[PDB]
Design a binder for this molecule. Sequence first.
Ligand code: NI
Length: 83
Amino acid sequence: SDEGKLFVGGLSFDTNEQSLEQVFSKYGQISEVVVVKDRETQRSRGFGFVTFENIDDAKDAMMAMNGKSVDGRQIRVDQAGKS
Ligand code: NI
């Protein structure tokens, strides 16, 4: 629902909020970054969300990062959908 929020998928098992912030901050100011984890075990589900303060920056980041390699894995970047 938030057009400034990007889904980032296909993460390596050890990719964390630090690597996402460093990568995506090139495109503008970031308000929230999260790697989604199992609640009980805290194991990464291999995707996350990056929210930009400015929606145009999210669009820029999607075009620039979708398909690019992070920690050896080609990531998928899309506007975050509902859920
Ligand atoms: Ni790694």
